[PDB]
């Protein structure tokens, strides 16, 4: 235990920032991230569905409401998939060095390591979940799209133009947002462990 | 007094739609409403103010987030003005044919009834405040945000466009929401009390 | 009784101005009112009947007389029918909420309500009747039509041109007049009741 | 005196059609009548005066109603003029052959008889007044009123046309009614008394 | 004569009562004639009274305007005899004649100044008799040289009247063609129905002359021809010798002249009376149509008024109706003779 | 007369209670007339009381403004008789007449200065009687030369009133065409329904004149024509000879003149009474429509107020409603006779 | 909605075959400038949108006394019938000018001369 | 990378067939001087490398009031379309001069006049 932690697992550490920020980061980035967007389009929607609910609803923001609740449910499918792909190589790397063979050594060694990673892998995934729930609270609709234009004349005018834009564009959002996310987030949590975390626990 | 309620507050019943919504009060009022909107446009804002927020946030999803908060502050000014104009004709409407004579009755009738009208004229004004606060509690990043794409090239590319949309949105809202308000609130609300609980209350 | 009147029948109230003045008012107006005129034509008359009586009568206003007495009798048929159509949905609405089920509650509840509506539904209908009787008192005949042109020469000249116009045009009148009437009149009386009237009586 | 009535008031009998209706009185009179009408046209009114009434009334059936009243005021002027011209020849007609001599008879005969003529010359003038007052007591809305069809579009559409017709009407009336009057009244009425009750009366 | 006096006077009174123009202008008789023709002698004989100044040569030497006026006092007063009233008509004559001779002399002198005398009596008709000074062709005594013209105009105011019986007396011993006397009479009645020419001194003509043409009534014919008279000579008159003596000579001339014998049956003063009367009646006849019509008109006037009288209140009319009836009857009677 | 007194007074009290314009302007009777026309004699006869100064020649020589005023004290006080209150009306007359004669003399003198006397009594109607000085055309005594105009203006303030019965008295022995008296009366009532012309001294006219045109009622016709009167002569008046004696002469003139016999049935003082009464009633009739309308208006006014009275909180109104009812009834009664 | 104007203008170049130069009734609002044969509007010779209307000073025109200006459709040559341009004429320059301010309000701006 | 400039210049010799003399939007950096039809950059009329750009005072030019200078490609005659040279104009000499310093930084040096 003294020999194994002290020397062997320090050359292992420095390999991680490096390659990732110049699979490792070189082609983690190109392949995965830029083929991800396709995934997006399929299990998501825009256009004329959006129009129906809003117009009935008034008879501007309040009308919009019904849409987003069911739409966000559909955003789980694509977003999650990208996440998992990163996880495979990176999460398994940490344990990928921690066995060093000796049956005396393995028994103590395992119990300390496995449980730490267990709790912490959940963090990153959860942050993705957060983004989806977000929608329900405000739902502004006056978008980068262009503005509209007894006492009917002022009221309904404003409804029509606004809502329509949002459905397409929100979909645009997620496709880039997941990939970006991962680099900052996914990355740091686990990174620590294998680099440094590992040697630390067994002692302490 | 039992007879007094039965007939005096019977003709008043039809008097209330009539006078308020029909120069007299009828179309003095309506005129007011269709001159209101012009006030809104001028005294509100767009463009470069919003942009400031970016600088703290970035140091991608987190960076976009900040935007929404800062818009609210200026929107108090316009909204109030409309409210006051309505008040004049309506409060004085009730008293104009609530006399039906008395040293006893006409007066005593007033003393309980006024107190409702105080609390209920307040409603409408309050709705203006509500709208402004509501905005702050969101900061979505699935908003307008569009798809991605020393390291100057990545920094300015997205940020520049971002600001434009969100600024617009508050302007549309106000013009429609203020007018609607009055119909529901001013007119009906206050009517209820004096119409019904009055008979009982006065003995108490 | 305290629970039922106080809360339950206040959300019921505000529904009435609203929809009617933007069946409810949306398609009460289009359908009923603009198919009504047809009704008119049938059971009413114009043209050459009018000519006969006037010319004999002198041997200008006095001559006209005989016509209108029997003509007004015929105006009852069409006018009434429009009236009733509005009544059906609106008069029955008020009682349409006043039962809330409890046999203890129903007995008191019914006796107070039914009799009020009874007396007041008659008002509106009566106003229609008034319009018809009106004719007999003056009967001017020099209409928008064009003027005419021993001591015979001045007298009879004037008779011919005038009378003829009126028969057609008076029929034109009624077809628009009934529909218009209803909105102002019908409307307000009952409106009050269900909105406010109802809660009031039981207490008082 | 018994003989005196029997023959003196026998030749007078035929004298009365004769002289009045046949220069003498015969065609001095007739001429007068056919120069009368021209007076009427000038000194009466149409067009825009009527229009004023609308403004109070509207705030649809009620709005039309007001019209009729305001016309009457100017119609006094012309009508009177005709009357006077007739008077001259007719009153002096009776006396021209009522003498048949006397210190007793011719004179005494006058004293009772004149008093009828006073009251009865008045008739004709009075009929002019009557016609004017009669008008005010109507205000029908089935009049000329034509079929219907911020809210500017509904306001001016109907109102504009409305005024034109009613203004005309008074003008026709006057020209025919004045001439007729004289025949019935002036001439015959006064004759009656002196012809018959005279014989008895004088003893009294 | 019986038609002229009675009928006229009777009519005249009725006309007075109605207050109308009575008229019925009674004949004025005047004698005109040459100097010494005998005018006063002729006039007084025919009238039947002695009251005209008479004298020698020229006789009427001053106008005598006499007016007979019916009046109750019965007297007479001269303009020159003031303060005396004569009741004796013979005394009247004596005064007139004496006064004339005394004041002018007996040498033909004349005077245009009238002698005014008015005889008031109830037994007379309202008449005017006028004796006028004799016309001359030649001056005598104290007469002017243009005496011929002055006298002529004076007399003409009376003699022109339609009802004036002119006895134009002319001396044959003076130029008949230059006689004023005959001219006047021929002027008023050319036909000679009521003019009878009196020629004097025909037997007293100068030897060697005669009036054959005039006297034979062919030069200027008259219906009744001529009647001659021979008045008092110069010697006789002076003594107050009376009228009678002159008359005797008168016949002699007409008888013996071969050229004038033929008209003897239309000679004398007596013959003159007979014819004259017939003409007088005629005069009334010509005036009658006019007078009658005036009376008729007044009656008719009120007739229509009567028609309107009867019946009603409307009186002199009634009284008037009766008065008219009387007047009409008199007019008719003259027409029916 | 029975329509005028009772009905008017009764109406007047009701109007007082409402605090409105009572009106019902009762006839003022005033006598105007030429100098010596007899104005005081005529006036006191018709009214029925002896209280007017009377005297010779010109009679009314000072204005007497008398006001009858209903009041509880019952007395009388003269402006010139201060400190004395008469209770004997006969004593009133004696004082008035004596004082006038003593101060002006008996030579026609006049004075514009009124004699103020006010008779307070509960047994009278609120009336104004005015005797006025007689108009002249010619000065006498100590009257000014333009007296004609001064007197005329003075009287006109009273006589122009629509309810003034003018007895225009004018002497026939003075120029009628230049008479001020007749002009005034003809001005106010040209038709002659209520003006009856009083012409005096018609039998006292100068020989050789007559009033034929005026008297025959064709120059300026009146409905009721004329009535003559003959008042006291100069000699009689001086002695305090009473009114009675003058009257006798009055009839004589009208009877005997052929041109005026025809109007005899419209002659006398007695006849004047009968006609006059009928006109008086008529006056009320013309004013009635106006008065009635005023009363009606007030009633209607509060009627709509009654409509708003009923229901709610909003009181003189109630009391007023009843008061009006009374007033209306009286007006109707005069119309229905 | 608001009436900006209403005023007569003379179409100075009206054909031989149409009576000659007559005055025709213009009605200007914030939305249209329409002209009829007269003010009763029984006709409708044309109804021109105020949208895309521009105004130019038409250089004298014919050899007349009129000072002409024209309204022209951005989309086409002729305005109505066989007319080349719709010639509107005033006797004074100023008269043309006052109408320019009324067009201004409705969104007919100058230039494109 | 660093923006040296950005400023308008008037192409004074723009054809009849292209609106006439208009101002066009120049963007200068250390690497390129590009000009578009306007500042939105929907167009790209050209994108000129800053490499081998040199600057000369073009001797008056046309008979105008402009003081002209030109940017010219070492490799070819015409700069774009049928233009002869790309004429850039300023009303003052000084205005031309301030731009010379901005080119200096990017490697556009003077001479070759």
Give a short summary of the structure.
Chain A is mainly α and 204 residues long. Chain A has helices at 2-8, 15-20, 25-42, 49-58, 61-64, 66-71, 76-95, 103-133, 157-163, 166-203.
Describe this structure in words.
- The structure holds 8 chains of a larger assembly.
- Chain A has a single domain, classed as Up-down Bundle (Four Helix Bundle (Hemerythrin (Met), subunit A)), CATH 1.20.120.1240.
- The two termini of chain A are 13 Å apart.
- Chain A is an all-alpha fold and 204 residues long.
- The relative contact order of chain A is 0.17.
- Chain A is built from ten helices and no strands.
- Chain A is 72% helix and 0% strand.
- Chain E has 337 residues and is α/β, with parallel strands linked by helices.
- Chain E has one domain (28-284): P-loop containing nucleotide triphosphate hydrolases (Rossmann fold), CATH 3.40.50.
- In chain E, the strands form two sheets. Chain E has a four-stranded parallel β-sheet with strand order 1-6-7-8, sandwiched between helices. In chain E, strands 3-4-2-5 form a four-stranded mixed β-sheet, with helices on one face.
- In chain E, helix 1 (5-18) runs antiparallel to helix 11, helix 4 (147-159) packs parallel to helix 5 (180-188) and helix 10 (269-307) runs antiparallel to helix 11.
- Chain E starts with a helix and ends with a helix.
- Chain D binds chain F through residues 103-104, and chain F through 261-265.
- Chains A, B, C, D: This is Dynamin-1.
- Chains A, B, C, D: It is found in: Cell membrane; Membrane, Clathrin-coated pit; Cytoplasmic vesicle; Presynapse.
- Chains A, B, C, D: Belongs to the TRAFAC class dynamin-like GTPase superfamily. Dynamin/Fzo/YdjA family.
